[PDB]
Design a protein around this ligand. Structure first.
Ligand SMILES: Nc1ncnc2c1ncn2[C@@H]1O[C@H](COP(=O)(O)OP(=O)(O)OP(=O)(O)O)[C@@H](O)[C@H]1O
Ligand SMILES: Nc1ncnc2c1ncn2[C@@H]1O[C@H](COP(=O)(O)OP(=O)(O)OP(=O)(O)O)[C@@H](O)[C@H]1O
Ligand SMILES: [Mg+2]
Ligand SMILES: [Mg+2]
Lengths: 147, 147
């Protein structure tokens, strides 16, 4: 019933648990699995700042992209090791606002399911939905499996 | 991968779409399907009030329960229409706070999936995640498919 399953991943343990359920559903349906990691742009952060960040807090401009890439590749590799055929899994890295970017990606690529962690890099003992999960679950055009 | 799927229903169009996806997954897995409609009982509706509700709005608990029962029974009927074996689908009606009652029921009954509408009786064109959906997705012990 699901032909193209999207798993947004952020390098968190919550996202890995989401990926694992995505893999289970992939095996049940034979769907394509699309993995996406969104990274924040330098501009989007400092655009909404009153004063500039000190140059002591500087990072390479492509360092966030490289990190997102490693995360997406970890996820792809894990998915294939867990039994998803390599030709069914595709990994992507996109710059931008996570919730916005995830929902746009899901619509553009005609994904019929998004599988997302309940919590992410800011996870805790709380049973509150992470901000990205909350926004994606609300705004996605397709069903959203919160894991 | 899902042996016991729960669909909380509230009589909304959003809940109907949730049921339809729950049935789809039931047919794929041969899972048991547990349908639950929660009614807010009289003490709960009157719990945090600065003034009593007027007579015409004071609907007694037996009538609130009867409405929930009708909804749950219709959902079971509709599930069977769409392919689910009668013996695999059970309807439940419970009094209490919906979010908390749904989460507790999933845990007690050992459900491994909850399928819930993104929106409910207050649903509209907007992309706001429903309050019950938000709370269930955050607090459920198992994955929550928000449709
Ligand atoms: N940048 C991102 N790229 C891809 N997926 C993401 C990204 N951020 C979050 N997610 C997805 O959303 C899930 C929930 O993460 P979310 O960011 O909502 O929670 P959190 O970080 O713990 O809380 P908050 O961000 O509100 O402090 C993650 O497990 C992941 O699946
Ligand atoms: N009393 C209930 N019993 C069982 N399931 C419910 C109940 N209320 C809501 N649900 C489930 O939650 C889904 C989302 O409904 P929710 O009440 O969260 O949104 P809403 O009514 O549109 O918005 P809000 O109530 O936040 O203004 C419904 O489609 C249904 O599956
Ligand atoms: Mg986060
Ligand atoms: Mg509601």
């Amino acid at each position: 019933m699901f032909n193209r399953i999207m798993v947004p991943v952020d390098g968190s343990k919550g996202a890995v648990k989401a990926l694992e359920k995505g893999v289970g559903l992939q095996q049940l349906t034979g769907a394509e699995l699309y993995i996406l990691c969104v990274f924040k742009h330098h501009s989007l952060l400092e655009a909404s700042l009153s004063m500039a960040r000190p140059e002591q807090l500087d990072i390479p401009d492509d360092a966030l992209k490289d990190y997102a890439t490693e995360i997406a590749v970890q996820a792809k590799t894990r998915a294939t090791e867990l039994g998803v055929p390599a030709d069914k899994v595709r990994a992507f890295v996109k710059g931008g606002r996570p919730s916005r970017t995830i929902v746009r990606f899901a619509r553009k690529r005609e994904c019929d399911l998004v599988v997302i962690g309940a919590q992410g890099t800011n996870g805790d003992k709380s049973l509150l939905l992470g901000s990205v999960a909350q926004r994606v679950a609300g705004s996605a055009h397709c069903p959203v499996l919160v894991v």
